[PDB]
Write a protein that binds this ligand. Structure first.
Ligand SMILES: Nc1ncnc2c1ncn2[C@@H]1O[C@H](COP(=O)(O)OP(=O)(O)OC[C@H]2O[C@H](O)[C@H](O)[C@@H]2O)[C@@H](O)[C@H]1O
Ligand SMILES: Nc1ncnc2c1ncn2[C@@H]1O[C@H](COP(=O)(O)OP(=O)(O)OC[C@H]2O[C@H](O)[C@H](O)[C@@H]2O)[C@@H](O)[C@H]1O
Ligand SMILES: CC(C)n1c(/C=C/[C@@H](O)C[C@@H](O)CC(=O)O)c(-c2ccc(F)cc2)c2ccccc21
Ligand SMILES: [Zn+2]
Ligand SMILES: [Zn+2]
Lengths: 282, 277
């Protein structure tokens, strides 16, 4: 809690220079095309471009705490817009180039971006979601659930039940949800490409799931401004703003990054849309 | 560098809700609305401000660095940026004055002939001879009005220089005159994300007061002229502008990607006006 191991905070940022950045995002493009089963793992770095501070970056929550300073929010959780990266992941899932998405974020922007819930594992919970203690029915609300650490919110289940509604925000002691951790674990083992965006991969086991892609010869790409726990296991490390890496990647894939309709909830992935034909790689 | 790192104020929801309704009334009641924007309308796209808690000057005074969560090239316009584009298209915004050099107003497709970029635009270089501007797709690599290395290509070969003013540099006369003219003639100035400490860029909203115009200030910190405002709103500008638009019955439009529009298009249809009192 107070004393919890918050891991390495405030490490130096690394910027790949343009030419080397340009060539790494082509290598990423080549890996996406070549792969049958692409899982994305996201952390707090995909939401900074929308005004929400990270945990272990230069100006992150834990970093500034060690220095006796406050993290700063440039928006509310309710007024946060999904980033170019968020929407990019929405399109990649609609054209069938993303099998599964595993996010350690509680900021709720994945769900709000319209990404389908049955293809998302929210390992650390969601600030807009409360859950019936009795029947496990989840409610995706339009404002943040007012509590953290899996406590009574004040509201009751309304299914065909009256059970106690509770927040989904894990405390330090709280084990991951079983459904999300099994679906994230299964997707990770079976993938032949895991890509990590904006996570420093220091948390167990959320950070270890990308290593499961390595077993049976799968490839691993790490996109991050700072060093990550598992940098040495990566076949490709890109050091750049994820928005810049994801817009350049989409351009290579010949994909437009769609308009954000405003807050929308999609329970179940739709049928896959048409996608460009694949380049000849050799 | 003026007063930096002042405490933030948050209006409570009920009060915030009420003030943005009072904003909505003033927009509807007003013949000629000008908006004045500063660094605060780009924070939510990952570009730090100057005198906010984590801003350039603040962090300098405390021997710390300002943090960028994007490049200038990869920055997307905020919900506020795109709201100003729609307000202009439906004829409820006469003019827009910005102290921002971040280039996002132009890239949002807001029309140049209705914008004054008082402190310059990092994506614009200007011919020293014929004053032809070039809006490029990557930041012009200099600041302080220096030669960039590139030449005029008009029907000229003159020296292209950046448009970023240094401290000593006088504002561009065209942009300052148009900004000043629009400010005097407006019956509503709204300021969004500016602390209004810079001369004269910060004083232009006060010219709206002369001949009984109204002034709204939307800002998280105190501003120089809080005392002259008929309405002060302490909230995230994005929240204020999305709630405001919702009252106006206006969608906030999709961003096509970087686009340059020289001249304002014909005004589009807008919802009918409420009966006010
Ligand atoms: N715009 C950007 N582009 C690319 N990388 C970025 C950007 N902004 C930040 N980063 C990088 O993004 C990385 C973010 O890493 P961390 O801050 O540790 O977040 P987590 O999601 O891994 O934290 C996991 C859990 O830990 C907590 O306890 C909670 O329970 C969280 O769920 C940094 O290395 C940045 O350099
Ligand atoms: N999301 C937000 N919502 C509302 N207000 C905000 C937000 N983020 C920041 N603010 C406020 O936004 C304000 C930003 O104040 P300053 O940083 O002085 O920006 P300027 O444009 O007025 O500076 C003018 C010139 O001065 C420089 O030298 C350069 O020349 C500039 O061009 C703060 O008061 C924040 O509380
Ligand atoms: C002013 C504007 C173009 N301008 C500068 C630029 C600021 C600095 O290069 C000059 C300043 O430090 C010294 C002086 O006062 O003359 C920065 C900026 C600040 C810190 C940073 F790490 C990178 C860029 C900046 C950021 C957002 C908007 C406008 C900005
Ligand atoms: Zn129930
Ligand atoms: Zn010329």
């Amino acid at each position: 809690p107070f004393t919890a191991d918050k891991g390495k905070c405030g490490l130096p940022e690394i910027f790949d220079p343009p030419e080397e950045l340009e060539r790494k995002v082509w290598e990423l493009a080549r890996l996406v095309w070549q792969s049958s089963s692409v899982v994305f793992h996201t952390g707090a770095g995909i939401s900074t471009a929308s005004g929400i501070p990270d945990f272990r970056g230069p100006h992150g929550v834990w970093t500034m705490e060690e220095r006796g300073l406050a993290p700063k929010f440039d928006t509310t959780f309710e007024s946060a817009r999904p980033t170019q990266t968020h929407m990019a992941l929405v399109q990649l899932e609609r054209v069938g180039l993303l099998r599964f998405l595993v996010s350690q974020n509680v900021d709720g922007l994945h769900v709000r971006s319209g990404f389908p819930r049955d293809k998302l594992a929210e390992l650390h919970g969601n600030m807009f979601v409360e859950e019936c203690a009795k029947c496990k029915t989840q409610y995706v609300r339009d404002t943040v659930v007012g509590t953290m650490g899996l406590k009574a919110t004040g509201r009751l289940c309304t299914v065909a039940c009256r059970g106690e509604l509770r927040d989904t925000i894990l405390d330090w002691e709280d084990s991951l949800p079983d459904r999300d951790l099994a679906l994230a674990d299964e997707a990770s083992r079976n993938a032949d490409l895991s890509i990590t965006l904006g996570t420093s991969l220091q948390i167990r086991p959320s950070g270890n799931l990308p290593l499961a892609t390595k077993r049976r010869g799968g490839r691993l790409v790490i996109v991050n401004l700072q060093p990550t726990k598992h940098d040495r296991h990566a076949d490709l490390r890109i050091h750049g703003y994820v928005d810049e890496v994801m817009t350049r990647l989409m351009k290579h894939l010949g994909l437009e990054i769609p308009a954000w309709d405003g807050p929308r909830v999609l329970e179940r992935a739709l049928p896959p849309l048409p996608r460009p034909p694949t380049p000849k790689l050799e």
